[PDB]
Ligand binder design. Structure first.
Ligand SMILES: CCCCCCCCCCCCCCCCCC(=O)OC[C@H](COP(=O)([O-])OCC(O)COP(=O)([O-])OC[C@@H](COC(=O)CCCCCCCCCCCCCCCCC)OC(=O)CCCCCCCCCCCCCCCCC)OC(=O)CCCCCCCCCCCCCCCCC
Ligand SMILES: COC1=C(OC)C(=O)C(C/C=C(/C)CC/C=C(/C)CC/C=C(/C)CC/C=C(\C)CC/C=C(\C)CC/C=C(\C)CC/C=C(/C)CC/C=C(/C)CC/C=C(/C)CCC=C(C)C)=C(C)C1=O
Ligand SMILES: CCCCCCCCCCCCCCCCC[C@@H](O)O[C@H](CO[C@H](O)CCCCCCCCCCCCCCC)COP(=O)(O)OCC[N+](C)(C)C
Ligand SMILES: NC(=O)C1=CN([C@@H]2O[C@H](COP(=O)(O)OP(=O)(O)OC[C@H]3O[C@@H](n4cnc5c(N)ncnc54)[C@H](OP(=O)(O)O)[C@@H]3O)[C@@H](O)[C@H]2O)C=CC1
Ligand code: SF4
Ligand code: SF4
Ligand code: SF4
Ligand SMILES: [Zn+2]
Lengths: 96, 63, 115, 342, 208, 176, 144, 156
């Protein structure tokens, strides 16, 4: 989700872009500014919320021992989904 | 035999420390306070000596 | 007796004679150093530098510290004579590349925080 | 002051000085010293170059990581000048040739290029401009070099009213063409001097003094629209100066007088070299021209610089010109020269 | 207790204790303490005046015969009045044993050179002088060995900073390498790793 | 148990003395050396045709660093700073903060590759397999500054080398 | 036996596509061996194999003459190999990406890039964190 | 034109001659000299590219700084670099020569050989493999191929 600064400089996922008056933009003259094009926040926002039939769900990020440490998520609040503290995936109980 | 030197001990001229970092420095002799986040007290036994904090600035490259 | 043993000298007088002996050797060596290392300084300049290096430690009153200083000066003299040192090491005594740090209050205040 | 430009540190290699300088002509004799002094403080130096990048290797150890940036530019292209001075708050102009190449004459390197640099710096928001002219620069001199220098000086002043103009005189140093030039003519058997060098007076200045003066002018608020004359502490007759030069190099001195027309002729003959000429007619004119005395102008003493006399620095340049027999001779052995001091 | 714990050797412990008592009995004038570690290492602490007698006895006595000097070094403990601790590690080829001899000194008191007893000590003592500033009396040639020429201060001492006081670079103005006060682009980051819970109760000190 | 290497004395037989004399006068041992070197002349050389052929490597090989992602495209790194605490050369610098969605993610992640000793302790310490040493080793630069990686460069390295890093991890994670 | 190695050399000349192809490979790769084509690349590289060679020569790549934007007829480098063929070519596996393709991820680069050092596409480091201290902004209106 | 074509051809010939004949100084300091030796070994055969070690600096084209530079050695390295006849090139090998590496915060180590001599190629690693140094050498060859000395002289 790269947006362009009013100076014409690409803005990174962190959000740092030089101000028009910053002399440090000269390092990109005759060269380029390195910006990763895939934003993790937007990529994780696209994932669907998983509905499960239990009050507590488990997440290891997938892949078994190739993911993250296994954690257990509580799904008792009906106004908000449960999010993994490592992976970012969202879970909820069937409502409505 | 022994020569009976009755002077104050001073090894300043032998340590090779620049005279800036001997006269303008101020050390603090203290027992460190317990980290209030934990109840362990093993880090409050000995005495520490540290120097006065000087200037730290941001690198123009990489910050 | 303070239970302290000497290195070489037992009072300030022998320490002073060793200092004087060392000083003569350094003073004598200076012209050979200027010729051998091909330094762009005068013999007067090098002898003034030797004088300044000796006077930096003129406030010492401990014969043991004076003995150790003379020992270090002997090692320095030996390195120069045998050409172990390089024009680099000899000219480090003069600090040509260093901007002189100001000493008055106002300049220190203007530049930064160091006292 | 744009926080990113606030000075920080102890003025060393890793410090921040707040100076962002675009040094034109940084690949020359004076440019290397200026860039070294700027990078000592921890300044951001922009080095515009047109030569081969191999000829800029010596400037890379002069700054910390990221503090020296090399960009390509064209003297006749103003977009390049805008590109290199866009983010700078100081611009230094050290561009100049001592001979006229087929692609650039004297008024291309001393008039057109300085004027374009000054105008682009003014319209790009640059705060300080340092322009280097000659001490003997006037519009009525027999030398095209000095005429172009004077025209370019006035035109730069027109394009950048608050620019600092510095007029040194016969800079001498290791990579100089002054002390080196005289030493180099030993091979030609004799030393040709117009009127035996008895009617010419020179006041050479040390290269390090000029670099320090430029650096001090960069960081002096009162030196905005002033003009400085960078001269040495002593004035010498040309005969005495060349005699001292040959004495320090321990070479036999065999001077002879040469008429102006013949020595101009041999300069013209040397001019045909497609490479750097050994000497030119303009070099002859400048060598056998007395140095102007401008006491109303500020000098190195007004920037805190105590001019270094030639006697304390001639050996470091002329020892390379000695033979093995005299290679280890010391500095105070060669009887300082006679001085025409007032 | 078998798989993961290092096994004990009581026979070597008894032998080393007996030999430590033996050395202590023979040299009462200089020996101040004898220890045997829990992993069978014999340490003998001596007064600084007894370096030559104790080392000569340990090299020449028929029962000891510690001919080879394995290592000689110093340890710096600033909280002690005698700042420096001189450690001698000797190896016996006849009896297949190793002994350690320890003494002390400070910044101004010289230690007697051990070069006559062991030829190998000449470089080791030069390094101790270079790194800690301990002067050795009667050394045939005492000078710096590891540091740069004209290096000021001793690096191994605790007070000396990790990065030193000066750094080097080449300057094109003077056409040589120059020394300047150290400036760091990125300062070394100090970590506080010690835990405030006691790990080894067997080493607990009295609380005064 | 020991053996002697040079305590053999030669026989004083008349024919043995004659053989030694013939060796001295006719240089037989030197001819033997020449024969050995001639035999090597006719062997196939061990040279490979770089850059068209490459030396063998292993999945364990430690190469240029990279920051990895989860299959969904979310970054794996959670700014625990275990890699920073374990780095023997102090080559890693990390800053973090809560992201706009509250996730615990870094804002700065630099590795000074002129400080790094390429020991791989950082990827052993990482609990989520975020930082790895990839298989790339041909990344020489022309300036010093190009070897001071930041988070953008490392994430791009991960995106570029994932197809190989994942396969190398798959072949070796059972030894870890 | 000598006539047979001569036949083998002649067959090497013939199997490279005539004399022109033989000279092309001889002046590009400095090698005239012929092996079975394991597969071709997305960018023009070809990967061959010859199991009768000793370990190290049994696999090789003939680089493409035209990478992303430059002409690589003479100027080739090892950084031109994509990661899957990079794994196959360095003998980290026995499986070419033609028989065992890598897993597809949406964030994986669809276009490999060589070492871009010395070109305008070179990486330039910078600080990725925001400004730490904010300064007070004086009011725009006069005070007296 | 005609003169620019001639100077372009002469640039091509000179650069080809210079890059095909790269003679490094027989110079090495630490760990990385072992991998440089392995590059000289039969598997990689640095000789087959025209690259042969020669002891004398006066007969050297390239300096490869392979190992840690210490404050005691820096004057010697600068001395042997200054005695190389030009054109001369410097390749930095490994972390220690690149930026100080694993002794960066030491009191006796120069934080990068580029504080002493200008560096043309920075080869990263600890130590870089023999193919890494080979890649660096071929990259230096390409950089030499890219230089234009007589084109710039002709346009002065
Ligand atoms: C002068 C006498 C030359 C006789 C000769 O060349 O035969 C060598 C031939 C080489 O055999 P080898 O190297 O031991 O076996 C390796 C395989 O043949 C390796 O065979 P290969 O598969 O690499 O064959 C590739 C082929 C093609 O190779 C080439 O075209 C590259 C070399 C061309 C050089 C011109 O090589 C040749 O057939 C040319 C052989 C030499 C001709 C010159 O064997 C002999 O005839 C020895 C004769 C005694 C010589 C003393
Ligand atoms: C610092 O820069 C400079 C140079 O660069 C290095 C020069 O060469 C240079 C000119 C000097 C040359 C190197 C010429 C050196 C060679 C001789 C002087 C050529 C003339 C000698 C004769 C032709 C001998 C022939 C025999 C006769 C009988 C006819 C000058 C002035 C200079 O200043
Ligand atoms: C008369 C005396 C003065 C001149 C003497 C000259 C002697 C003869 C000239 C020698 C000719 C050989 C040069 C051509 C060989 C180049 C080979 C070819 O590969 O070059 C390619 C590019 O073309 C060359 O750069 C052309 C260079 C030559 C240009 C024309 C030569 C002009 C000669 C003019 C001589 C006139 C001098 C007379 C003055 C009195 C790139 O190759 P490269 O890839 O890198 O090398 C292999 C690396 N691989 C494996 C990756 C492929
Ligand atoms: N040195 C002296 O004795 C005196 C010097 N000055 C002035 O000081 C300035 C520099 O002195 P110095 O450095 O000794 O002169 P140099 O010739 O030694 O340096 C010349 C500089 O100008 C650049 N340059 C020359 N022509 C052009 C051009 N046409 N287009 C772009 N860049 C060009 C060169 O770059 P490249 O190398 O790439 O051409 C080089 O960096 C000059 O203006 C000179 O007149 C004043 C009084 C006396
Ligand atoms: S490989 Fe080792 S030195 Fe390099 S970043 Fe990881 S832990 Fe630090
Ligand atoms: S890379 Fe791994 S170890 Fe390092 S901060 Fe991120 S999650 Fe923690
Ligand atoms: S970079 Fe690593 S391998 Fe090379 S010299 Fe330094 S410590 Fe040794
Ligand atoms: Zn998860």
């Amino acid at each position: 989700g790269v947006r362009t600064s009013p100076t014409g400089e690409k803005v990174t996922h962190t959000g740092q872009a030089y101000d028009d008056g910053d002399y440090r933009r000269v390092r990109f003259s005759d060269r380029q500014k390195e910006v990763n094009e895939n934003f993790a926040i937007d990529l994780i926002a696209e994932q669907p919320v998983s509905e499960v039939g239990s009050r507590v769900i488990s997440c290891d990020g997938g892949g078994g021992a190739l993911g993250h440490p296994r954690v257990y998520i509580n799904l008792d609040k009906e106004t908000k989904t449960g999010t993994c503290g490592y992976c970012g995936l969202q879970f909820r109980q069937p409502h409505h | 035999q022994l020569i009976a030197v009755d002077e104050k001990l001073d090894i300043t001229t032998l340590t090779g420390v620049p005279e800036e970092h001997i006269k303008t420095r101020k050390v603090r002799i203290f027992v460190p306070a317990r980290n209030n986040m934990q109840s362990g007290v093993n880090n409050t036994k000995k005495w520490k000596m540290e120097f006065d904090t000087r200037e730290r600035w941001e690198n123009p490259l990489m910050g | 007796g303070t239970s302290v043993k000497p290195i070489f000298s037992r009072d300030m007088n022998e320490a002073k004679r060793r200092v004087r002996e060392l000083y003569r050797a350094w003073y004598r060596e200076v012209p050979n150093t200027v010729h051998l290392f091909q330094l762009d300084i005068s013999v007067k300049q090098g002898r003034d530098k030797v004088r300044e290096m000796f006077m930096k430690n003129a406030h010492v009153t401990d014969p043991r510290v004076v003995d150790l200083l003379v020992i270090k000066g002997k090692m320095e003299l030996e390195e120069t004579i045998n050409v172990w040192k390089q024009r680099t090491h000899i000219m480090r005594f003069f600090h040509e590349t260093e901007a002189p740090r100001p000493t008055d209050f106002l300049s220190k205040f203007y530049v930064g925080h160091d006292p | 002051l744009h926080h990113a430009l606030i000075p920080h540190g102890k003025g060393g290699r890793s410090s921040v000085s707040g100076i962002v300088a675009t040094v034109f002509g940084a690949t020359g004799f004076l440019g290397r010293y200026v860039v070294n002094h700027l990078g000592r403080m921890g300044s951001q130096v922009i080095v515009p170059y047109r030569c081969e990048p191999y000829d800029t290797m010596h400037l890379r150890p002069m700054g910390d990581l990221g503090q020296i940036i090399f960009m390509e530019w064209n003297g006749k292209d103003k977009d390049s000048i805008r590109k290199v001075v866009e983010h700078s708050n100081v611009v230094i102009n050290l561009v100049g040739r001592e001979w006229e190449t087929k692609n650039f004459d004297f008024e291309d390197v001393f008039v057109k290029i300085p004027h374009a640099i000054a105008q682009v710096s003014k319209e790009a928001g640059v705060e300080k401009l340092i322009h280097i002219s000659h001490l003997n620069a006037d519009i009525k001199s027999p030398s095209r070099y000095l005429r172009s220098k004077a025209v370019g000086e006035k035109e730069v002043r027109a394009a950048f009213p608050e620019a600092t103009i510095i007029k040194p005189s016969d800079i001498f140093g290791r990579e100089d063409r002054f002390l080196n030039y005289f030493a180099s003519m030993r091979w030609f058997g004799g030393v040709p001097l117009i009127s035996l060098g008895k009617e010419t007076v020179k006041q050479p200045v040390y290269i390090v003094d000029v670099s320090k003066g430029i650096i001090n002018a960069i960081k002096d608020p009162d030196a905005k629209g002033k003009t400085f004359a960078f001269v040495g502490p002593n004035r010498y007759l040309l005969f005495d100066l060349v005699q001292y030069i040959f004495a320090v190099a321990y070479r036999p001195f065999l001077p002879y007088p040469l008429p102006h027309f013949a020595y101009r002729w041999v300069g013209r003959l040397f001019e045909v070299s497609p490479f750097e000429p050994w000497t030119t007619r303009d070099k002859v004119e400048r060598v056998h021209m007395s140095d102007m005395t401008l006491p109303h102008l500020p000098g190195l003493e007004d920037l805190g610089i105590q001019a270094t006399p030639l006697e304390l620095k001639a050996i470091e340049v002329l020892r390379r010109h000695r033979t093995y027999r005299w290679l280890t001779s010391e500095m105070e052995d060669v009887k300082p020269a006679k001085t025409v001091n007032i | 207790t078998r798989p993961t714990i290092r096994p004990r050797n009581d026979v070597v412990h008894k032998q080393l204790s007996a030999f430590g008592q033996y050395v202590a009995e023979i040299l009462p004038k200089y020996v101040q303490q004898v220890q045997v570690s829990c992993f069978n290492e014999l340490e003998i602490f001596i007064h600084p005046d007894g370096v030559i007698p104790v080392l000569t006895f340990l090299r020449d006595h028929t029962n000891a015969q510690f001919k080879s000097l394995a290592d000689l070094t110093a340890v710096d403990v600033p909280t002690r009045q005698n700042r420096f601790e001189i450690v001698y590690n000797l190896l016996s080829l006849r009896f297949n044993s190793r002994i350690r001899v320890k003494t002390y000194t400070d910044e101004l008191t010289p230690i007697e050179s051990s070069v006559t007893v062991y030829k190998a000590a000449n470089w080791y003592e030069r390094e101790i002088w270079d790194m800690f500033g301990v002067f050795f009396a009667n050394h045939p040639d005492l000078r710096r060995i590891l540091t740069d020429y004209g290096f000021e201060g001793h690096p191994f001492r605790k007070d000396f900073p990790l990065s030193g006081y000066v750094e080097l670079r080449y300057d094109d103005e003077v056409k040589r390498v120059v020394a300047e006060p150290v400036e760091l682009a990125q300062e070394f980051r100090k970590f506080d790793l010690n835990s405030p819970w006691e790990a080894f109760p067997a080493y607990r000190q009295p609380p005064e | 148990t020991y053996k002697f290497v040079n305590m053999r004395e030669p026989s004083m037989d008349m024919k043995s003395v004659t053989d030694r004399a013939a060796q001295t006068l006719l240089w037989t041992e030197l001819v033997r050396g020449l024969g050995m070197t001639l035999s090597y002349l006719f062997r196939e050389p061990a040279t490979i045709n770089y850059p068209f052929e490459k030396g063998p490597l292993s999945p364990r090989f430690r190469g240029e660093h990279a920051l990895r992602r989860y299959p969904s495209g979310e970054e794996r790194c959670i700014a625990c700073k275990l890699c920073e605490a374990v780095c023997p050369a102090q080559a890693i610098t990390i800053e973090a903060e809560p992201r706009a969605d509250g996730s615990r993610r870094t804002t700065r992640y630099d590795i000074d590759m002129t400080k790094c000793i390429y020991c791989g302790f950082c990827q052993e310490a990482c609990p989520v397999d975020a930082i790895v040493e990839g298989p790339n080793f041909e990344f020489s630069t022309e300036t010093h500054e190009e070897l001071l990686y930041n988070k953008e460069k490392l994430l791009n390295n991960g995106d570029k080398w994932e197809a190989e890093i994942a396969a190398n991890i798959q072949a070796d994670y059972l030894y870890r | 036996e000598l006539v047979q190695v001569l036949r083998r050399g002649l067959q090497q000349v013939s199997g490279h596509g005539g004399l022109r192809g033989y000279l092309r490979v001889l002046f590009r790769a400095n090698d005239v061996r012929v092996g079975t084509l394991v597969g071709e690349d997305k960018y023009g590289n070809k990967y061959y194999e010859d199991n009768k060679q000793f370990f190290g020569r049994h696999r090789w790549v003939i680089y493409t003459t035209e990478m992303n934007g430059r002409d690589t007829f003479w100027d080739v480098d090892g950084s031109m190999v994509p990661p899957e063929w990079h794994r196959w070519l360095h003998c980290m596996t026995d499986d070419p990406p033609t028989t065992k393709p890598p897993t597809a991820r949406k964030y994986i680069w669809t276009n490999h890039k060589f070492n871009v050092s010395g070109t305008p596409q070179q990486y330039v480091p910078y600080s990725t964190t925001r400004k730490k201290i904010q300064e007070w902004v004086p009011p725009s209106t006069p005070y007296k | 034109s005609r003169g620019e074509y001639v100077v372009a051809k002469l640039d091509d010939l000179v650069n080809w001659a210079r890059r095909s004949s790269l003679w490094p100084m027989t110079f090495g300091l630490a760990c990385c000299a072992v991998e440089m030796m392995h590059m000289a070994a039969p598997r990689y055969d640095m000789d087959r590219f025209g690259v042969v070690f020669r002891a004398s600096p006066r007969q050297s084209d390239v300096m490869i700084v392979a190992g840690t530079l210490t404050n005691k050695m820096a004057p010697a390295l600068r001395k042997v670099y200054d005695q190389m006849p030009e054109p001369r090139y410097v390749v930095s090998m490994g972390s220690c020569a690149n930026g100080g590496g694993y002794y960066h915060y030491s009191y006796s180590v120069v934080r990068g050989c580029d504080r002493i001599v200008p560096v043309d190629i920075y080869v990263p690693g600890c130590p870089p493999t023999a193919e890494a140094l080979l890649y660096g050498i071929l990259q230096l060859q390409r950089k030499i191929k890219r230089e234009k000395r007589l084109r710039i002289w002709y346009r002065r």
